[PDB]
Amino acid sequence: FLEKIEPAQEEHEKYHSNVKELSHKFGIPNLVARQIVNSCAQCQQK
Amino acid sequence: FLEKIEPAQEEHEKYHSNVKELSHKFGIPNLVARQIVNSCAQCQQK
Ligand SMILES: [Zn+2]
Ligand SMILES: [Zn+2]
Numbered sequence: 001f002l003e004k005i006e007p008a009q010e011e012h013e014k015y016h017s018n019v020k021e022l023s024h025k026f027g028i029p030n031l032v033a034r035q036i037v038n039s040c041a042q043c044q045q046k
Numbered sequence: 047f048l049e050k051i052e053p054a055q056e057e058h059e060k061y062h063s064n065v066k067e068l069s070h071k072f073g074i075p076n077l078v079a080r081q082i083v084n085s086c087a088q089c090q091q092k
Contacts (some may be wrong), residue, residue, distance in 0.1 A: 034092070
């Protein structure tokens with residue numbers, strides 16, 4: 001689970017990539033990707 | 047992703063199974079399981 005999903009977490013931390021970006025770039029569903037963005041504080045706050 | 051994880055979502059809705067239960071019962075990591083409990087409103091509020 002944290003094999004291919006982890007690398008995606010590092011991608012957001014470098015370019016604040018959105019869910020579609022993480023999912024479309026790596027392949028993880030829109031939910032697993034949103035978890036990365038949801039974890040991001042700078043992105044969490046609107 | 048929603049193949050084996052889905053069935054687990056229904057398990058919590060029938061016995062409010064904790065993360066360890068969902069993960070230990072089905073096999074999903076502690077995170078994917080916590081997502082089920084986290085979604086539960088009755089369990090969300092402490
Ligand atoms: Zn971000
Ligand atoms: Zn519950």
